[PDB]
Amino acid sequence: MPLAKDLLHPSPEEEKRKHKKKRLVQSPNSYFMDVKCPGCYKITTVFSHAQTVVLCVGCSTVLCQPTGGKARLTEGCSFRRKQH
């Protein structure tokens, strides 16, 4: 920090670097995504930090496994974020 940097207009690379609670206004790092699998093809919605072992509407035994951070998908056809 120099003597004169203005605090009202952080650049997006200054804001994306810092902790979620310490930004100028708060925002989560997590997201919603839509997920699809082989053998049965009814698309479903998942949260990227899931704690549940998700079962799809296609009745496959595991869609994803839980983990200490992001959940990992069982080689499913999509990891696509929803926009909003």
Cβ burial of 66 (10 Å; 0-12, 13-18, 19+) is middle
Question: Any idea what DSSP says for residue 32?
Answer: E
Centre a 10 Å sphere on the Cβ of residue 76 and count the other Cβ atoms it contains. 17
**Residue span binding RNA (CB under 7 A) among the ranges 5-13, 16-24, 36-44, 53-61:** 16-24
Q: Determine, following the binding rule CB under 7 A, whether residue 32 of this chain makes contact with RNA.
A: yes
Site for RNA, residues 42 to 71, rule: CB under 7 A: 47, 49, 51, 67-70
How many residues interact with RNA (rule CB under 7 A)?
A: 20
**Separation CA 23–CA 39 (nearest Å):** 44
Residues of the shown chain interacting with RNA in the complex, contacts defined by CB under 7 A: 1, 17-20, 22, 28-32, 47, 49, 51, 67-70, 72, 75
